[PDB]
Amino acid sequence: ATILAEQLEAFVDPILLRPVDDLELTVRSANCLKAEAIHYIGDLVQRTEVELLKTPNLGKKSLTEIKDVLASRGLSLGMRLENWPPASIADE
Amino acid sequence: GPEEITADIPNVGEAALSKLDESGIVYIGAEVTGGDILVGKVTPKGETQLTPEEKLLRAIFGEKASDVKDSSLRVPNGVSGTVIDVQVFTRDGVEKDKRA
Amino acid sequence: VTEVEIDGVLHEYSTKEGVQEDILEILLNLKGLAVRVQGKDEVILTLNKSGIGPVTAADITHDGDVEIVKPQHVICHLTDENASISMRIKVQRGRGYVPASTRE
Amino acid sequence: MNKEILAVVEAVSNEKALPREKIFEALESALATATKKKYEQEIDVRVQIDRKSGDFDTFRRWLVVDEVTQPTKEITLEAARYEDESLNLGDYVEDQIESVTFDRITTQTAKQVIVQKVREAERAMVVDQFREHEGEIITGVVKKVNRDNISLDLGNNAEAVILREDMLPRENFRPGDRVRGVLYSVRPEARGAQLFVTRSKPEMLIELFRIEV
């Protein structure tokens, strides 16, 4: 093996991060939140439900759809973010 | 009652009908393995008589005149393939489903 | 090459309207494609061609590192005025012979 | 409001004295169980019992607390400030809904889960029946012979288990014989109330002589 080697050394939250339109509900339930220039459900969780109820852009059926979405407790739980990002949501 | 050719059957898994459409018949082009489901088929079971504990199930679910087992067509154990052509023939009078 | 996705083709045993070879023969002619890649593991090449005549191997929209070494290689023959193929080709590195049955 | 459940409520051969409404909830979650597997968790036994309705739509809950345990059923007062502090401490305020699990299919599995729920209700009823007496000098007839255990069959579809440790050493019993003793198990047993008699205790023959003289 020494001879043959020397013969070769000259070669070698996921619901909040998802969009409102990605929700299982209809497009109207997403558009009710999207009328306030919201694209992510994290923006919906950043605002209170009372603040959304004080705007007539949401409808009566949209309130029931929002309740059905909040029944999973992933969104609209009355939270407050920095702007968008949590610590797990970090830039890398 | 008759047999159900629809996908709506029990004892299944995401691996039980992840290649079937909304009406039981496998797609044209779905490359299957040995032992998947091509046509989902459920048949009737026992009749006997209406029991005391099943007296409420005698008529409270539309099509509750039949029971439900499992007799779906499967690829015989060993062969792979790619489904290239599906024929559906219907005896006249029977309701055509959405894929027919 | 590993994967091909012709646009209007479900399974490899079908036929596309307006090309005088089957989809299986197009897969063999793409299997014989002689291509160099430079700085990637795998890469996705794009092919678009419309009009009467051959679809040579020089009709692939080349990326910034993929280099075809024989551009006269025929794939298929389009045979009508409005009948066009549009496919995505997946070309990757490897070693030996890796068939389809082992590894969609 | 098809009124099928209304007349399905009043069957009522065996669940007249049993909790009717609870059996609808039972059967409704059983129609909702069977082929559910996605959603977020499972279903919900709790559901707005609307007698009139009949097919009570499985509603969810939010349970107002001051704690962070049971994530899909958790409120606080600070979250109740968006509702203008209308929520109080400890309430079970429902703020969500659920649907059904289907078709052709999923409904003999729903029949199967309807049966499962009926069985659970029957077990509860049997427990209540055994609690009514709470151990007495009743007899019975052997039917099955298990390892170090004797199965007895009484009246009104009732079964009792005879421990071999509470039995006589030489005196061996078999099927077809009739034995009598005092039970001492009707509370916590196993999926109901396993009637456990003891034909070896003194109080066992306390009324045995009383039955004669």
From Swiss-Prot, chain A:
Residues 13-92 are annotated as: Alpha C-terminal domain (alpha-CTD). The modification N6-acetyllysine is found at K60, K61. The modification ADP-ribosylarginine is found at R28. Acetylated on Lys-60 and Lys-61 in the presence of glucose. PatZ controls acetylation of Lys-61 but not of Lys-60. (Microbial infection) ADP-ribosylated on both alpha subunits by the phage T4 protein ModA. ADP-ribosylated on only one of the alpha subunits by the phage T4 protein Alt. Belongs to the RNA polymerase alpha chain family. DNA-dependent RNA polymerase (RNAP) catalyzes the transcription of DNA into RNA using the four ribonucleoside triphosphates as substrates. This subunit plays an important role in subunit assembly since its dimerization is the first step in the sequential assembly of subunits to form the holoenzyme. Homodimer. The RNAP catalytic core consists of 2 alpha, 1 beta, 1 beta' and 1 omega subunit. When a sigma factor is associated with the core the holoenzyme is formed, which can initiate transcription. Both the N- and C-terminus interact with different regions of transcriptional regulator CRP. The rRNA transcription and antitermination complex (rrnTAC) consists of RNAP, NusA, NusB, NusE (rpsJ), NusG, SubB, ribosomal protein S4, DNA and precursor rRNA; S4 is more flexible than other subunits. The N-terminal domain is essential for RNAP assembly and basal transcription, whereas the C-terminal domain is involved in interaction with transcriptional regulators (such as CRP) and with upstream promoter elements. This is DNA-directed RNA polymerase subunit alpha. It comes from Escherichia coli (strain K12).
UniProtKB/Swiss-Prot annotation, chain B:
It comes from the Bacteria. Co-administration of salinamide and rifampicin or salinamide and myxopyronin suppresses the emergence of resistance to both antibiotics. Acetylated on several lysine residues in the presence of glucose. The RNAP catalytic core consists of 2 alpha, 1 beta, 1 beta' and 1 omega subunit. When a sigma factor is associated with the core the holoenzyme is formed, which can initiate transcription. The rRNA transcription and antitermination complex (rrnTAC) consists of RNAP, NusA, NusB, NusE (rpsJ), NusG, SubB, ribosomal protein S4, DNA and precursor rRNA; S4 is more flexible than other subunits. In pull-down experiments interacts with CedA. (Microbial infection) Interacts (via flap domain) with Escherichia phage lambda antitermination protein Q; this interaction renders bacterial RNAP resistant to transcription pausing and allows it to read through termination signals. Belongs to the RNA polymerase beta chain family. DNA-dependent RNA polymerase (RNAP) catalyzes the transcription of DNA into RNA using the four ribonucleoside triphosphates as substrates. This is DNA-directed RNA polymerase subunit beta. It comes from Escherichia coli (strain K12). The gene is rpoB. The chain holds residues 846 to 945 of 1342 of the full protein.
